[PDB]
PDB file of C-alpha atoms in Angstrom:
ATOM      1  CA  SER H   1       0.000   0.000   0.000  1.00  0.00           C
ATOM      2  CA  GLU H   2       2.143   2.854   1.335  1.00  0.00           C
ATOM      3  CA  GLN H   3       5.285   1.863  -0.621  1.00  0.00           C
ATOM      4  CA  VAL H   4       3.454   1.506  -3.966  1.00  0.00           C
ATOM      5  CA  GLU H   5       1.868   4.690  -2.735  1.00  0.00           C
ATOM      6  CA  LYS H   6       5.212   6.294  -2.089  1.00  0.00           C
ATOM      7  CA  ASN H   7       5.981   4.821  -5.508  1.00  0.00           C
ATOM      8  CA  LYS H   8       3.659   7.079  -7.648  1.00  0.00           C
ATOM      9  CA  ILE H   9       4.623  10.221  -5.557  1.00  0.00           C
ATOM     10  CA  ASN H  10       7.691  10.372  -7.699  1.00  0.00           C
ATOM     11  CA  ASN H  11       6.898  11.230 -11.278  1.00  0.00           C
ATOM     12  CA  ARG H  12       4.725  13.707  -9.394  1.00  0.00           C
ATOM     13  CA  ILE H  13       6.569  16.791  -8.050  1.00  0.00           C
ATOM     14  CA  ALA H  14       7.046  18.494 -11.411  1.00  0.00           C
ATOM     15  CA  UNK H  15      36.419  19.873  -8.268  1.00  0.00           C
ATOM     16  CA  UNK H  16      33.716  18.385  -6.043  1.00  0.00           C
ATOM     17  CA  UNK H  17      32.139  21.831  -5.721  1.00  0.00           C
ATOM     18  CA  UNK H  18      32.230  22.463  -9.471  1.00  0.00           C
ATOM     19  CA  UNK H  19      30.671  19.072 -10.205  1.00  0.00           C
ATOM     20  CA  UNK H  20      27.885  19.511  -7.652  1.00  0.00           C
ATOM     21  CA  UNK H  21      27.098  22.960  -9.051  1.00  0.00           C
ATOM     22  CA  UNK H  22      27.013  21.872 -12.695  1.00  0.00           C
ATOM     23  CA  UNK H  23      24.714  19.027 -11.647  1.00  0.00           C
ATOM     24  CA  UNK H  24      22.212  20.991  -9.560  1.00  0.00           C
ATOM     25  CA  UNK H  25      22.387  23.377 -12.517  1.00  0.00           C
ATOM     26  CA  UNK H  26      21.640  21.334 -15.640  1.00  0.00           C
ATOM     27  CA  UNK H  27      18.368  22.577 -17.132  1.00  0.00           C
ATOM     28  CA  UNK H  28      20.578  24.627 -19.477  1.00  0.00           C
ATOM     29  CA  UNK H  29      19.264  23.571 -22.887  1.00  0.00           C
ATOM     30  CA  UNK H  30      15.791  23.066 -21.429  1.00  0.00           C
ATOM     31  CA  UNK H  31      15.403  26.704 -22.485  1.00  0.00           C
ATOM     32  CA  UNK H  32      18.931  28.107 -22.746  1.00  0.00           C
ATOM     33  CA  UNK H  33      19.106  28.882 -19.019  1.00  0.00           C
ATOM     34  CA  UNK H  34      22.777  29.639 -19.671  1.00  0.00           C
ATOM     35  CA  UNK H  35      21.518  32.728 -21.540  1.00  0.00           C
ATOM     36  CA  UNK H  36      18.893  34.063 -19.109  1.00  0.00           C
ATOM     37  CA  UNK H  37      21.712  33.609 -16.616  1.00  0.00           C
ATOM     38  CA  UNK H  38      21.605  30.621 -14.273  1.00  0.00           C
ATOM     39  CA  UNK H  39      23.283  27.960 -16.489  1.00  0.00           C
ATOM     40  CA  UNK H  40      25.768  30.190 -18.352  1.00  0.00           C
ATOM     41  CA  UNK H  41      26.658  32.372 -15.322  1.00  0.00           C
ATOM     42  CA  UNK H  42      26.977  29.628 -12.687  1.00  0.00           C
ATOM     43  CA  UNK H  43      28.839  27.259 -15.054  1.00  0.00           C
ATOM     44  CA  UNK H  44      31.333  29.709 -16.552  1.00  0.00           C
ATOM     45  CA  UNK H  45      31.984  31.248 -13.099  1.00  0.00           C
ATOM     46  CA  UNK H  46      32.452  28.141 -10.965  1.00  0.00           C
ATOM     47  CA  UNK H  47      33.911  26.316 -13.898  1.00  0.00           C
ATOM     48  CA  UNK H  48      36.682  28.591 -15.228  1.00  0.00           C
TER      49      UNK H  48
ATOM     50  CA  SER E   1      23.578 -13.390  22.006  1.00  0.00           C
ATOM     51  CA  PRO E   2      27.179 -14.116  23.048  1.00  0.00           C
ATOM     52  CA  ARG E   3      27.895 -17.808  22.646  1.00  0.00           C
ATOM     53  CA  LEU E   4      25.563 -18.746  19.754  1.00  0.00           C
ATOM     54  CA  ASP E   5      26.991 -19.344  16.222  1.00  0.00           C
ATOM     55  CA  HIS E   6      24.123 -17.587  14.431  1.00  0.00           C
ATOM     56  CA  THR E   7      25.114 -19.668  11.393  1.00  0.00           C
ATOM     57  CA  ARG E   8      23.133 -22.523  12.950  1.00  0.00           C
ATOM     58  CA  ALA E   9      19.982 -20.459  13.524  1.00  0.00           C
ATOM     59  CA  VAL E  10      18.854 -18.376  10.541  1.00  0.00           C
ATOM     60  CA  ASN E  11      18.886 -21.736   8.750  1.00  0.00           C
ATOM     61  CA  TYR E  12      16.121 -23.063  11.013  1.00  0.00           C
ATOM     62  CA  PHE E  13      14.140 -19.858  10.430  1.00  0.00           C
ATOM     63  CA  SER E  14      14.319 -19.655   6.600  1.00  0.00           C
ATOM     64  CA  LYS E  15      12.948 -23.139   5.929  1.00  0.00           C
ATOM     65  CA  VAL E  16      10.306 -22.120   8.505  1.00  0.00           C
ATOM     66  CA  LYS E  17       8.488 -19.338   6.623  1.00  0.00           C
ATOM     67  CA  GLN E  18       8.643 -17.414   9.890  1.00  0.00           C
ATOM     68  CA  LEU E  19      12.110 -15.837   9.978  1.00  0.00           C
ATOM     69  CA  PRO E  20      10.979 -12.185  10.069  1.00  0.00           C
ATOM     70  CA  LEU E  21      10.047 -12.425  13.751  1.00  0.00           C
ATOM     71  CA  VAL E  22      13.828 -12.322  14.119  1.00  0.00           C
ATOM     72  CA  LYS E  23      13.623  -8.972  12.308  1.00  0.00           C
ATOM     73  CA  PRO E  24      14.667  -7.116  15.494  1.00  0.00           C
ATOM     74  CA  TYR E  25      16.745 -10.154  16.456  1.00  0.00           C
ATOM     75  CA  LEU E  26      18.774  -8.860  13.517  1.00  0.00           C
ATOM     76  CA  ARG E  27      18.756  -5.290  14.957  1.00  0.00           C
ATOM     77  CA  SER E  28      21.375  -5.025  17.696  1.00  0.00           C
ATOM     78  CA  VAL E  29      22.945  -7.974  15.814  1.00  0.00           C
ATOM     79  CA  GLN E  30      24.190  -7.637  12.223  1.00  0.00           C
ATOM     80  CA  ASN E  31      27.521  -6.374  13.620  1.00  0.00           C
ATOM     81  CA  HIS E  32      28.620  -9.991  13.237  1.00  0.00           C
ATOM     82  CA  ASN E  33      28.756  -9.200   9.509  1.00  0.00           C
ATOM     83  CA  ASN E  34      27.356 -12.751   9.143  1.00  0.00           C
ATOM     84  CA  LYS E  35      26.023 -13.842   5.749  1.00  0.00           C
ATOM     85  CA  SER E  36      22.665 -15.353   6.679  1.00  0.00           C
ATOM     86  CA  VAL E  37      22.023 -11.885   8.178  1.00  0.00           C
ATOM     87  CA  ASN E  38      22.520  -9.542   5.213  1.00  0.00           C
ATOM     88  CA  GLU E  39      21.636 -12.404   2.740  1.00  0.00           C
ATOM     89  CA  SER E  40      18.031 -13.022   3.794  1.00  0.00           C
ATOM     90  CA  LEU E  41      18.098  -9.646   5.617  1.00  0.00           C
ATOM     91  CA  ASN E  42      18.261  -8.067   2.159  1.00  0.00           C
ATOM     92  CA  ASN E  43      15.734 -10.605   0.870  1.00  0.00           C
ATOM     93  CA  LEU E  44      13.636  -9.122   3.681  1.00  0.00           C
ATOM     94  CA  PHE E  45      14.151  -5.433   2.911  1.00  0.00           C
ATOM     95  CA  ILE E  46      13.443  -6.448  -0.710  1.00  0.00           C
ATOM     96  CA  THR E  47       9.984  -8.026  -0.605  1.00  0.00           C
ATOM     97  CA  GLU E  48       9.170  -5.718   2.331  1.00  0.00           C
ATOM     98  CA  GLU E  49      10.123  -2.654   0.249  1.00  0.00           C
ATOM     99  CA  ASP E  50      12.582  -1.265   2.789  1.00  0.00           C
ATOM    100  CA  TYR E  51      15.298   0.945   1.282  1.00  0.00           C
ATOM    101  CA  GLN E  52      16.365   3.233   4.140  1.00  0.00           C
ATOM    102  CA  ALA E  53      17.323   0.272   6.301  1.00  0.00           C
ATOM    103  CA  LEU E  54      18.365  -2.023   3.432  1.00  0.00           C
ATOM    104  CA  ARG E  55      20.661   0.746   2.172  1.00  0.00           C
ATOM    105  CA  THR E  56      22.098   1.304   5.660  1.00  0.00           C
ATOM    106  CA  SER E  57      21.719  -2.426   6.300  1.00  0.00           C
ATOM    107  CA  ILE E  58      24.642  -2.576   3.882  1.00  0.00           C
ATOM    108  CA  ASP E  59      26.161   0.898   4.309  1.00  0.00           C
ATOM    109  CA  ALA E  60      28.885  -0.844   6.303  1.00  0.00           C
ATOM    110  CA  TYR E  61      28.661  -4.653   6.520  1.00  0.00           C
ATOM    111  CA  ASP E  62      29.736  -5.912   3.078  1.00  0.00           C
ATOM    112  CA  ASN E  63      29.403  -9.669   3.657  1.00  0.00           C
ATOM    113  CA  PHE E  64      27.102 -11.026   0.958  1.00  0.00           C
ATOM    114  CA  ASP E  65      26.568 -12.197  -2.623  1.00  0.00           C
ATOM    115  CA  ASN E  66      27.150  -9.005  -4.600  1.00  0.00           C
ATOM    116  CA  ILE E  67      25.322 -10.392  -7.637  1.00  0.00           C
ATOM    117  CA  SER E  68      22.079 -12.387  -7.752  1.00  0.00           C
ATOM    118  CA  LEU E  69      20.905 -10.009  -5.014  1.00  0.00           C
ATOM    119  CA  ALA E  70      20.594  -7.209  -7.577  1.00  0.00           C
ATOM    120  CA  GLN E  71      19.094  -9.743  -9.992  1.00  0.00           C
ATOM    121  CA  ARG E  72      15.773  -9.912  -8.126  1.00  0.00           C
ATOM    122  CA  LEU E  73      15.778  -6.130  -7.747  1.00  0.00           C
ATOM    123  CA  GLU E  74      16.050  -5.424 -11.486  1.00  0.00           C
ATOM    124  CA  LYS E  75      12.977  -7.610 -11.984  1.00  0.00           C
ATOM    125  CA  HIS E  76      10.999  -4.945 -10.107  1.00  0.00           C
ATOM    126  CA  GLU E  77       8.634  -2.211 -11.265  1.00  0.00           C
ATOM    127  CA  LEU E  78       9.292   0.120  -8.351  1.00  0.00           C
ATOM    128  CA  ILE E  79      12.631   1.626  -9.371  1.00  0.00           C
ATOM    129  CA  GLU E  80      13.575   2.095  -5.693  1.00  0.00           C
ATOM    130  CA  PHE E  81      15.490  -1.171  -5.947  1.00  0.00           C
ATOM    131  CA  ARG E  82      15.874  -0.927  -9.729  1.00  0.00           C
ATOM    132  CA  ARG E  83      17.674   2.254  -8.701  1.00  0.00           C
ATOM    133  CA  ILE E  84      19.764   0.566  -6.021  1.00  0.00           C
ATOM    134  CA  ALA E  85      20.161  -2.699  -7.933  1.00  0.00           C
ATOM    135  CA  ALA E  86      21.721  -0.212 -10.321  1.00  0.00           C
ATOM    136  CA  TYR E  87      23.953   0.933  -7.467  1.00  0.00           C
ATOM    137  CA  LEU E  88      24.406  -2.533  -5.923  1.00  0.00           C
ATOM    138  CA  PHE E  89      25.713  -3.847  -9.245  1.00  0.00           C
ATOM    139  CA  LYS E  90      27.954  -0.783  -9.712  1.00  0.00           C
ATOM    140  CA  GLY E  91      29.218  -0.616  -6.114  1.00  0.00           C
ATOM    141  CA  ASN E  92      32.538   1.251  -6.088  1.00  0.00           C
ATOM    142  CA  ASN E  93      32.745   0.008  -9.683  1.00  0.00           C
ATOM    143  CA  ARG E  94      31.189   2.675 -11.996  1.00  0.00           C
ATOM    144  CA  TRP E  95      31.597   0.806 -15.300  1.00  0.00           C
ATOM    145  CA  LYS E  96      28.700  -1.619 -14.714  1.00  0.00           C
ATOM    146  CA  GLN E  97      25.974   0.972 -13.912  1.00  0.00           C
ATOM    147  CA  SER E  98      26.448   2.960 -17.135  1.00  0.00           C
ATOM    148  CA  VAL E  99      27.317   0.148 -19.589  1.00  0.00           C
ATOM    149  CA  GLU E 100      23.895  -1.241 -18.586  1.00  0.00           C
ATOM    150  CA  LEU E 101      21.209   1.352 -19.587  1.00  0.00           C
ATOM    151  CA  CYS E 102      19.121   1.631 -22.751  1.00  0.00           C
ATOM    152  CA  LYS E 103      15.834   3.512 -23.046  1.00  0.00           C
ATOM    153  CA  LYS E 104      14.710   2.599 -19.522  1.00  0.00           C
ATOM    154  CA  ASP E 105      16.817   3.589 -16.504  1.00  0.00           C
ATOM    155  CA  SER E 106      18.273   6.161 -18.837  1.00  0.00           C
ATOM    156  CA  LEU E 107      17.689   8.978 -16.349  1.00  0.00           C
ATOM    157  CA  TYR E 108      18.627  12.394 -17.791  1.00  0.00           C
ATOM    158  CA  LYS E 109      19.876  12.832 -14.192  1.00  0.00           C
ATOM    159  CA  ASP E 110      22.169  10.390 -12.366  1.00  0.00           C
ATOM    160  CA  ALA E 111      23.380   9.290 -15.828  1.00  0.00           C
ATOM    161  CA  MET E 112      25.095  12.664 -16.164  1.00  0.00           C
ATOM    162  CA  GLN E 113      26.855  12.096 -12.839  1.00  0.00           C
ATOM    163  CA  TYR E 114      27.932   8.446 -12.611  1.00  0.00           C
ATOM    164  CA  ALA E 115      30.217   8.796 -15.641  1.00  0.00           C
ATOM    165  CA  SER E 116      32.367  11.572 -14.113  1.00  0.00           C
ATOM    166  CA  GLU E 117      34.078   9.375 -11.507  1.00  0.00           C
ATOM    167  CA  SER E 118      34.932   6.833 -14.248  1.00  0.00           C
ATOM    168  CA  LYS E 119      38.479   6.163 -15.471  1.00  0.00           C
ATOM    169  CA  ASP E 120      37.907   4.327 -18.759  1.00  0.00           C
ATOM    170  CA  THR E 121      38.018   7.730 -20.513  1.00  0.00           C
ATOM    171  CA  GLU E 122      36.910   6.490 -23.944  1.00  0.00           C
ATOM    172  CA  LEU E 123      33.589   5.421 -22.384  1.00  0.00           C
ATOM    173  CA  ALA E 124      32.852   9.130 -22.767  1.00  0.00           C
ATOM    174  CA  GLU E 125      32.875   8.663 -26.537  1.00  0.00           C
ATOM    175  CA  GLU E 126      30.720   5.609 -25.833  1.00  0.00           C
ATOM    176  CA  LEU E 127      28.150   7.622 -23.879  1.00  0.00           C
ATOM    177  CA  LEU E 128      28.463  10.733 -26.045  1.00  0.00           C
ATOM    178  CA  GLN E 129      28.349   8.874 -29.376  1.00  0.00           C
ATOM    179  CA  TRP E 130      25.059   7.524 -27.967  1.00  0.00           C
ATOM    180  CA  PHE E 131      23.737  10.873 -26.706  1.00  0.00           C
ATOM    181  CA  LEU E 132      23.821  11.939 -30.363  1.00  0.00           C
ATOM    182  CA  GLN E 133      21.768   9.122 -31.848  1.00  0.00           C
ATOM    183  CA  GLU E 134      19.143   8.833 -29.050  1.00  0.00           C
ATOM    184  CA  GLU E 135      19.075  11.999 -26.941  1.00  0.00           C
ATOM    185  CA  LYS E 136      19.458  15.785 -27.102  1.00  0.00           C
ATOM    186  CA  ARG E 137      20.862  16.855 -23.736  1.00  0.00           C
ATOM    187  CA  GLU E 138      24.139  16.153 -25.539  1.00  0.00           C
ATOM    188  CA  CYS E 139      24.944  19.665 -24.349  1.00  0.00           C
ATOM    189  CA  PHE E 140      25.138  18.717 -20.678  1.00  0.00           C
ATOM    190  CA  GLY E 141      26.615  15.510 -22.049  1.00  0.00           C
ATOM    191  CA  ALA E 142      29.528  16.664 -24.177  1.00  0.00           C
ATOM    192  CA  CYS E 143      30.171  19.296 -21.479  1.00  0.00           C
ATOM    193  CA  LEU E 144      30.180  17.756 -17.987  1.00  0.00           C
ATOM    194  CA  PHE E 145      32.499  15.377 -19.837  1.00  0.00           C
ATOM    195  CA  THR E 146      35.105  18.123 -20.546  1.00  0.00           C
ATOM    196  CA  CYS E 147      35.423  20.279 -17.367  1.00  0.00           C
ATOM    197  CA  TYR E 148      36.903  17.371 -15.389  1.00  0.00           C
ATOM    198  CA  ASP E 149      40.524  17.766 -16.496  1.00  0.00           C
ATOM    199  CA  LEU E 150      40.065  16.941 -20.138  1.00  0.00           C
ATOM    200  CA  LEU E 151      38.596  13.596 -21.227  1.00  0.00           C
ATOM    201  CA  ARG E 152      37.034  15.344 -24.268  1.00  0.00           C
ATOM    202  CA  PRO E 153      40.133  15.782 -26.518  1.00  0.00           C
ATOM    203  CA  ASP E 154      40.426  17.108 -30.070  1.00  0.00           C
ATOM    204  CA  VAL E 155      39.170  13.757 -31.318  1.00  0.00           C
ATOM    205  CA  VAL E 156      35.683  14.551 -30.007  1.00  0.00           C
ATOM    206  CA  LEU E 157      35.640  18.323 -30.560  1.00  0.00           C
ATOM    207  CA  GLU E 158      36.008  17.447 -34.250  1.00  0.00           C
ATOM    208  CA  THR E 159      33.838  14.348 -34.504  1.00  0.00           C
ATOM    209  CA  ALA E 160      31.103  17.001 -34.258  1.00  0.00           C
ATOM    210  CA  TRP E 161      32.357  18.972 -37.262  1.00  0.00           C
ATOM    211  CA  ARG E 162      32.396  16.188 -39.836  1.00  0.00           C
ATOM    212  CA  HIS E 163      29.129  15.025 -38.300  1.00  0.00           C
ATOM    213  CA  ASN E 164      26.813  17.810 -37.046  1.00  0.00           C
ATOM    214  CA  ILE E 165      27.615  21.060 -38.893  1.00  0.00           C
ATOM    215  CA  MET E 166      24.825  22.723 -36.751  1.00  0.00           C
ATOM    216  CA  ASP E 167      24.626  21.660 -33.086  1.00  0.00           C
ATOM    217  CA  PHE E 168      27.850  22.253 -31.185  1.00  0.00           C
ATOM    218  CA  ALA E 169      27.797  25.823 -29.865  1.00  0.00           C
ATOM    219  CA  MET E 170      27.748  25.764 -26.052  1.00  0.00           C
ATOM    220  CA  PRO E 171      31.184  26.134 -24.450  1.00  0.00           C
ATOM    221  CA  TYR E 172      31.636  26.957 -20.853  1.00  0.00           C
ATOM    222  CA  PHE E 173      34.455  24.354 -20.636  1.00  0.00           C
ATOM    223  CA  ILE E 174      36.473  24.484 -23.835  1.00  0.00           C
ATOM    224  CA  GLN E 175      37.778  27.808 -22.535  1.00  0.00           C
ATOM    225  CA  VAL E 176      38.159  26.536 -18.977  1.00  0.00           C
ATOM    226  CA  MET E 177      40.928  24.470 -20.543  1.00  0.00           C
ATOM    227  CA  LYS E 178      42.025  27.417 -22.721  1.00  0.00           C
ATOM    228  CA  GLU E 179      43.465  29.899 -20.237  1.00  0.00           C
ATOM    229  CA  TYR E 180      44.090  26.779 -18.165  1.00  0.00           C
ATOM    230  CA  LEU E 181      46.470  25.902 -20.989  1.00  0.00           C
ATOM    231  CA  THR E 182      47.300  29.605 -20.890  1.00  0.00           C
ATOM    232  CA  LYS E 183      47.921  29.790 -17.135  1.00  0.00           C
ATOM    233  CA  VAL E 184      50.031  26.665 -16.736  1.00  0.00           C
ATOM    234  CA  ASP E 185      51.753  28.552 -19.549  1.00  0.00           C
ATOM    235  CA  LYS E 186      51.895  31.607 -17.279  1.00  0.00           C
ATOM    236  CA  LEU E 187      53.803  29.876 -14.473  1.00  0.00           C
ATOM    237  CA  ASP E 188      55.889  28.000 -17.063  1.00  0.00           C
ATOM    238  CA  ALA E 189      57.078  31.134 -18.836  1.00  0.00           C
ATOM    239  CA  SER E 190      57.625  32.374 -15.284  1.00  0.00           C
ATOM    240  CA  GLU E 191      60.079  29.589 -14.386  1.00  0.00           C
ATOM    241  CA  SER E 192      61.636  29.914 -17.829  1.00  0.00           C
ATOM    242  CA  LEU E 193      62.489  33.488 -16.860  1.00  0.00           C
ATOM    243  CA  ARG E 194      63.523  32.173 -13.443  1.00  0.00           C
ATOM    244  CA  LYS E 195      66.228  30.211 -15.261  1.00  0.00           C
ATOM    245  CA  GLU E 196      67.110  33.048 -17.664  1.00  0.00           C
ATOM    246  CA  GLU E 197      67.476  35.551 -14.785  1.00  0.00           C
ATOM    247  CA  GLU E 198      69.661  33.420 -12.532  1.00  0.00           C
ATOM    248  CA  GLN E 199      71.829  32.264 -15.481  1.00  0.00           C
ATOM    249  CA  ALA E 200      72.553  35.724 -16.932  1.00  0.00           C
ATOM    250  CA  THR E 201      73.262  36.847 -13.354  1.00  0.00           C
ATOM    251  CA  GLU E 202      75.728  34.216 -12.123  1.00  0.00           C
ATOM    252  CA  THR E 203      77.328  34.451 -15.581  1.00  0.00           C
ATOM    253  CA  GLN E 204      77.626  38.127 -16.534  1.00  0.00           C
TER     254      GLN E 204
ATOM    255  CA  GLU P   1      34.350  47.955 -19.360  1.00  0.00           C
ATOM    256  CA  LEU P   2      34.547  49.504 -22.827  1.00  0.00           C
ATOM    257  CA  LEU P   3      33.605  46.314 -24.670  1.00  0.00           C
ATOM    258  CA  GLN P   4      30.696  45.412 -22.368  1.00  0.00           C
ATOM    259  CA  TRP P   5      29.478  48.912 -23.313  1.00  0.00           C
ATOM    260  CA  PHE P   6      30.151  48.588 -27.057  1.00  0.00           C
ATOM    261  CA  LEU P   7      27.600  45.764 -26.968  1.00  0.00           C
ATOM    262  CA  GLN P   8      24.718  47.624 -25.344  1.00  0.00           C
ATOM    263  CA  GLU P   9      25.142  50.982 -27.165  1.00  0.00           C
ATOM    264  CA  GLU P  10      27.222  50.533 -30.326  1.00  0.00           C
ATOM    265  CA  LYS P  11      27.958  48.125 -33.189  1.00  0.00           C
ATOM    266  CA  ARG P  12      31.568  48.723 -34.199  1.00  0.00           C
ATOM    267  CA  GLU P  13      32.150  46.133 -31.474  1.00  0.00           C
ATOM    268  CA  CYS P  14      34.133  44.446 -34.233  1.00  0.00           C
ATOM    269  CA  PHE P  15      36.889  47.049 -34.278  1.00  0.00           C
ATOM    270  CA  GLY P  16      36.257  47.141 -30.545  1.00  0.00           C
ATOM    271  CA  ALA P  17      36.659  43.539 -29.451  1.00  0.00           C
ATOM    272  CA  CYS P  18      39.543  43.324 -31.955  1.00  0.00           C
ATOM    273  CA  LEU P  19      41.953  46.257 -31.566  1.00  0.00           C
ATOM    274  CA  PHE P  20      41.617  45.116 -27.957  1.00  0.00           C
ATOM    275  CA  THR P  21      43.164  41.663 -28.684  1.00  0.00           C
ATOM    276  CA  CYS P  22      46.132  42.187 -31.085  1.00  0.00           C
ATOM    277  CA  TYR P  23      48.103  44.115 -28.437  1.00  0.00           C
ATOM    278  CA  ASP P  24      50.016  40.799 -26.246  1.00  0.00           C
ATOM    279  CA  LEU P  25      46.752  39.596 -24.833  1.00  0.00           C
ATOM    280  CA  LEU P  26      44.753  41.745 -22.396  1.00  0.00           C
ATOM    281  CA  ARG P  27      41.519  40.252 -23.825  1.00  0.00           C
ATOM    282  CA  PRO P  28      41.559  36.765 -22.190  1.00  0.00           C
ATOM    283  CA  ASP P  29      38.963  33.988 -22.270  1.00  0.00           C
ATOM    284  CA  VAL P  30      36.965  35.912 -19.688  1.00  0.00           C
ATOM    285  CA  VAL P  31      36.041  38.517 -22.311  1.00  0.00           C
ATOM    286  CA  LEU P  32      35.857  36.273 -25.393  1.00  0.00           C
ATOM    287  CA  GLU P  33      33.028  34.526 -23.534  1.00  0.00           C
ATOM    288  CA  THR P  34      31.317  37.456 -21.844  1.00  0.00           C
ATOM    289  CA  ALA P  35      30.116  38.018 -25.424  1.00  0.00           C
ATOM    290  CA  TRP P  36      28.577  34.555 -25.751  1.00  0.00           C
ATOM    291  CA  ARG P  37      26.312  34.620 -22.710  1.00  0.00           C
ATOM    292  CA  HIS P  38      24.569  37.081 -25.004  1.00  0.00           C
ATOM    293  CA  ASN P  39      25.197  37.050 -28.792  1.00  0.00           C
ATOM    294  CA  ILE P  40      24.883  33.510 -30.203  1.00  0.00           C
ATOM    295  CA  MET P  41      25.094  35.431 -33.588  1.00  0.00           C
ATOM    296  CA  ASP P  42      27.624  38.278 -33.807  1.00  0.00           C
ATOM    297  CA  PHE P  43      31.173  37.183 -33.051  1.00  0.00           C
ATOM    298  CA  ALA P  44      32.738  36.089 -36.347  1.00  0.00           C
ATOM    299  CA  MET P  45      35.595  38.422 -37.301  1.00  0.00           C
ATOM    300  CA  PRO P  46      39.034  37.208 -36.199  1.00  0.00           C
ATOM    301  CA  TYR P  47      42.190  38.638 -37.536  1.00  0.00           C
ATOM    302  CA  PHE P  48      43.689  38.570 -33.995  1.00  0.00           C
ATOM    303  CA  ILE P  49      42.539  35.412 -32.258  1.00  0.00           C
ATOM    304  CA  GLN P  50      44.901  33.593 -34.621  1.00  0.00           C
ATOM    305  CA  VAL P  51      47.639  36.201 -34.270  1.00  0.00           C
ATOM    306  CA  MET P  52      47.836  34.797 -30.748  1.00  0.00           C
ATOM    307  CA  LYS P  53      47.351  31.233 -32.050  1.00  0.00           C
ATOM    308  CA  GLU P  54      50.557  30.500 -33.954  1.00  0.00           C
ATOM    309  CA  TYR P  55      52.011  33.101 -31.589  1.00  0.00           C
ATOM    310  CA  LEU P  56      51.201  30.515 -28.935  1.00  0.00           C
ATOM    311  CA  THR P  57      52.413  28.047 -31.559  1.00  0.00           C
ATOM    312  CA  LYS P  58      55.690  29.828 -32.322  1.00  0.00           C
ATOM    313  CA  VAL P  59      56.799  30.565 -28.769  1.00  0.00           C
ATOM    314  CA  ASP P  60      56.046  26.842 -28.719  1.00  0.00           C
ATOM    315  CA  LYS P  61      58.375  26.429 -31.709  1.00  0.00           C
ATOM    316  CA  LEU P  62      61.418  27.949 -30.000  1.00  0.00           C
ATOM    317  CA  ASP P  63      60.441  26.229 -26.737  1.00  0.00           C
ATOM    318  CA  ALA P  64      60.353  22.747 -28.242  1.00  0.00           C
ATOM    319  CA  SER P  65      63.609  23.865 -29.860  1.00  0.00           C
ATOM    320  CA  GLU P  66      65.367  24.512 -26.529  1.00  0.00           C
ATOM    321  CA  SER P  67      63.771  21.374 -25.128  1.00  0.00           C
ATOM    322  CA  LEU P  68      65.639  19.482 -27.852  1.00  0.00           C
ATOM    323  CA  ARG P  69      68.671  21.645 -27.091  1.00  0.00           C
ATOM    324  CA  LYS P  70      68.651  20.073 -23.625  1.00  0.00           C
ATOM    325  CA  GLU P  71      67.843  16.560 -24.891  1.00  0.00           C
ATOM    326  CA  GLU P  72      70.685  16.685 -27.465  1.00  0.00           C
ATOM    327  CA  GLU P  73      73.416  17.934 -25.149  1.00  0.00           C
ATOM    328  CA  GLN P  74      72.330  15.548 -22.337  1.00  0.00           C
ATOM    329  CA  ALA P  75      72.256  12.354 -24.432  1.00  0.00           C
ATOM    330  CA  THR P  76      75.614  13.456 -25.879  1.00  0.00           C
ATOM    331  CA  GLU P  77      77.660  14.211 -22.750  1.00  0.00           C
ATOM    332  CA  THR P  78      76.073  11.084 -21.256  1.00  0.00           C
ATOM    333  CA  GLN P  79      74.520   7.693 -22.025  1.00  0.00           C
TER     334      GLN P  79
END
């Protein structure tokens, strides 16, 4: 019950440093976030 | 507790269809790293759907059959274990987890993170070459690849020219390596002058 | 400062982002990119970017040359 219930919930809510950032950043192409700012700014900056 | 062999107990429980009573019996215990413990213990956390414990139930004690265990997990629908069976099979060995993907379990997410720690460099071309024919986040692909030192050489930066004329503009990274290969050049020219300077001095 | 401004207020950015470069290099990667964030289109021009290329391919010439200098004398005086 609860587990299969917990199941569906997902599919339902919509160096090290550099790596982590880039990851929690992604969404770039999704709409060119690296243009608006986020993606491009964050990446370039904490990427040099 | 002290002064049982455990090995001669779980056996009487398993062929009993009642072993779970010992669930807590496995609580303060499981320090013994014993096999019957983890072995069915996992089998327990598996059909029971426990992941928090199961994960921690093995976040230390590594005494078990690192194989078939993940075989029953893959056969699931609830990715929880199809997500850990993914881990369980990879376990401090990143090559398995990626080289075993395809449409399913191709998560635009963890797939862009479990490659990074790899060492079989070329596997990047493996993944990337694939990104091209089957996905579009090639951007995040061909990029997160690069930024870690350089695993994305000239070989790949070109593959995209012959191939995809259009599609390639993105760079964050290609330049990270540029002044990087312009800064190591800084300090290098610096020590070159070091030499020059001392030489001319001691010998003028 | 100047360049960032060229972009938002003028178009000769070409002569701008260029006469900048040709002198050693004061226009690093930092600036060559600042222009991307924005302008996908608008950037093709180069005269200079390559002036620094074989420049950073010629200083490499003489450098490999002295590297071999070393190699040559070493192997000679000793084996």
